[PDB]
Amino acid sequence: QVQLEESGPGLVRPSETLSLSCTVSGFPMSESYFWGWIRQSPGKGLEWLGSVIHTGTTYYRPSLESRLTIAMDPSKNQVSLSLTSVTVADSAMYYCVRIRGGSSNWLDPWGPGIVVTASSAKTTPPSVYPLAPGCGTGSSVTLGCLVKGYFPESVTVTWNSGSLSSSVHTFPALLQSGLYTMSSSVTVPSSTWPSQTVTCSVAHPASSTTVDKKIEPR
Amino acid sequence: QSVWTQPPSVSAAPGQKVTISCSGDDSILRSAFVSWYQQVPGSAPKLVIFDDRQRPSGIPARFSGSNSGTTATLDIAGLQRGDEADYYCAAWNGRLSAFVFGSGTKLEIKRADAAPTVSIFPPSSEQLTSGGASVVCFLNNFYPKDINVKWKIDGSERQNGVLNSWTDQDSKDSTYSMSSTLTLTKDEYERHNSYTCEATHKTSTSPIVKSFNRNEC
Amino acid sequence: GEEGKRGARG
């Protein structure tokens, strides 16, 4: 059954070309389906960009048709997006889709999506700070990691508590001074930490950086 | 229109039914096959209805759709906590010759009111060394979403330097969580002893108060 | 044939 994954840069500078690729697996691109691109800006809705079929017929969002090229390569099982003269407004999650055309125009499946930021700001890795309880507990204990001063989105925070299961909350980032801050909380039985180690791992693909913090008692 | 009109929000309890509408100008939707997408926060949209009323294989029959021509409607019956998501309709607009999505509807799954579990955290030595001091409060697994947080430094309210961030609704227990972060300079942080995070939530007329005193160390 | 284009219902 159809498998899709997007690739490309997470950061592009204004006026440069945004080039994304999507690999299609487990399905023939020579069948009667379109292959296309949708985007979604943070906290906003879905926007159809365009699509293409193996015969070469192509459709575009009218407002972007001057900047946008969508193409496919059946030999590589790829569909590509190329958006020229990018501006800040092109910052979005970009999704590859298979489209059943004609009069149906249904989209299934969707790739996991790739986050793209259009900005002149410099890539900055996160600083990661442990959140441990202060001096002076009930049946659970909550710990955290504070992730500060990174750009662009996104980071992924995970918690290594060994074989112990845990309840995690990841808070959405907030931008400030051109830098994002987010945090993550982890909750475990009070009988488990500190004898069971609990460590956050913070990956920031844009800066090729991974930071771990083991939460130790104060 | 270049975006179909949907209500911003619908809310109901598990087992109950909601309907979500999707409208265009006059009877433009009569000329199109409407599809519907479920987007769980943090995931890609997923096709739930196509060609107005058809279900992809594996989508349960409690998701159903219709297209009246003036408005299209997604029904979701037998609500489950995992149904919390944004739902988008979509359809070709022949007048614009473009594929148009709806503005999106967030489905909230109701639950019993729940007080937050509140946890407070001093700044780490590591952060201080670099000049800043963030005091963090987690207010976790509460319902409903509305909540007020106040910070106090030595018992006195602090207005500036507070940033709050909410999660999306939890797919398993229908609660919300929030982080509240008070950022001061290191020098400022070190001038005081007690830091307090107070949560005011409808589950109590009295605030939930969590504090730490630096002199406890 | 119709599947080779994208548009409104006939």
Side-chain angles (χ1 to χ4, degrees), chain A, chain B residues 2-217, chain C residues 1-5 7-10:
Chain A
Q1 191 53 217
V2 183
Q3 302 296 280
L4 302 176
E5 188 154 27
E6 303 88 357
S7 54
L11 185 61
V12 59
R13 309 308 185 180
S15 89
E16 312 289 19
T17 300
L18 175 51
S19 299
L20 298 178
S21 180
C22 173
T23 306
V24 182
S25 286
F27 197 80
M29 296 191 87
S30 65
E31 276 191 24
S32 296
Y33 290 81
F34 283 78
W35 302 94
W37 291 94
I38 314 297
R39 70 180 183 184
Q40 188 175 35
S41 279
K44 306 165 55 55
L46 299 166
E47 191 167 67
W48 175 83
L49 302 172
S51 61
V52 62
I53 185 160
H54 67 84
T55 65
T57 298
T58 304
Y59 297 93
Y60 296 118
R61 181 177 210 73
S63 61
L64 300 177
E65 69 205 351
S66 63
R67 302 199 285 125
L68 192 52
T69 302
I70 294 169
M72 45 178 287
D73 188 0
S75 68
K76 297 190 177 171
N77 278 301
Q78 285 191 27
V79 60
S80 58
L81 170 145
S82 179
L83 179 73
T84 61
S85 303
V86 301
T87 76
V88 59
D90 299 310
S91 299
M93 181 79 74
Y94 286 73
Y95 295 111
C96 184
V97 292
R98 186 189 61 161
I99 294 153
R100 179 59 161 180
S103 64
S104 289
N105 301 292
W106 55 252
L107 285 47
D108 184 26
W110 297 57
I114 182 157
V115 181
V116 184
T117 294
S119 178
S120 298
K122 317 205 326 306
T123 302
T124 310
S127 291
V128 185
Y129 302 120
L131 304 174
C135 319
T137 181
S139 73
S140 79
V141 63
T142 293
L143 312 176
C145 277
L146 173 64
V147 179
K148 193 168 173 59
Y150 70 95
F151 186 81
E153 288 274 57
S154 57
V155 297
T156 183
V157 186
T158 56
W159 288 97
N160 191 331
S161 57
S163 60
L164 181 61
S165 179
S166 73
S167 152
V168 173
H169 298 289
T170 309
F171 302 91
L174 303 177
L175 184 71
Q176 50 163 227
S177 133
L179 306 172
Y180 291 96
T181 297
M182 62 81 78
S183 62
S184 176
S185 73
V186 65
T187 303
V188 293
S190 44
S191 61
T192 59
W193 179 88
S195 50
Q196 169 58 63
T197 55
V198 175
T199 296
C200 73
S201 191
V202 179
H204 187 227
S207 69
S208 295
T209 293
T210 304
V211 191
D212 290 18
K213 291 288 143 167
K214 183 191 201 181
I215 312 304
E216 296 182 316
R218 197 173 302 273
Chain B
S2 62
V3 176
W4 308 121
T5 292
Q6 295 183 234
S9 157
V10 295
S11 188
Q16 297 181 344
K17 186 177 175 168
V18 291
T19 69
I20 296 168
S21 63
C22 171
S23 304
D25 292 345
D26 61 80
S27 298
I28 193 168
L29 291 184
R30 202 164 168 282
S31 70
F33 272 129
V34 178
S35 56
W36 294 87
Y37 303 86
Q38 175 191 67
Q39 190 178 30
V40 171
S43 287
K46 179 175 186 202
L47 186 71
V48 295
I49 296 293
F50 69 92
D51 293 352
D52 298 335
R53 68 184 32 250
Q54 306 297 329
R55 275 178 290 120
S57 189
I59 300 306
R62 69 203 181 73
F63 293 85
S64 70
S66 63
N67 181 350
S68 297
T70 53
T71 298
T73 306
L74 175 68
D75 287 4
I76 312 173
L79 284 165
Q80 289 171 15
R81 295 199 184 290
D83 296 337
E84 67 78 26
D86 296 328
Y87 296 83
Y88 294 88
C89 61
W92 194 266
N93 183 328
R95 295 184 193 161
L96 301 174
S97 198
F99 190 63
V100 171
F101 286 95
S103 51
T105 299
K106 188 178 297 306
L107 172 53
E108 181 181 54
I109 306 300
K110 294 180 183 308
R111 59 157 289 137
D113 286 7
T117 301
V118 187
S119 291
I120 189 164
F121 303 87
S124 64
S125 49
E126 196 172 353
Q127 187 190 9
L128 296 172
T129 212
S130 185
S134 299
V135 193
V136 179
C137 188
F138 295 125
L139 308 91
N140 285 172
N141 301 84
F142 61 90
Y143 189 93
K145 192 166 189 141
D146 304 296
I147 192 166
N148 290 151
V149 171
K150 183 185 302 308
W151 287 87
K152 295 185 182 179
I153 296 179
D154 283 325
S156 295
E157 178 163 351
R158 175 68 188 187
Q159 303 274 28
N160 296 65
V162 180
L163 284 176
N164 298 322
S165 192
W166 281 263
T167 62
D168 300 286
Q169 188 172 36
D170 189 274
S171 69
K172 307 309 285 154
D173 78 2
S174 309
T175 65
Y176 297 91
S177 291
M178 186 195 28
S179 79
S180 181
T181 302
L182 170 58
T183 301
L184 304 160
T185 63
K186 170 191 55 154
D187 292 346
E188 285 176 324
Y189 171 75
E190 292 186 341
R191 293 312 262 234
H192 317 284
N193 189 71
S194 88
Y195 288 86
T196 302
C197 172
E198 310 205 345
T200 292
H201 194 60
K202 75 176 285 194
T203 52
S204 177
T205 198
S206 183
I208 292 168
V209 176
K210 286 284 177 103
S211 302
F212 64 84
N213 299 306
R214 284 167 77 221
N215 66 3
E216 288 280 336
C217 298
Chain C
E2 298 93 325
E3 275 58 74
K5 65 159 293 213
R9 298 192 65 179

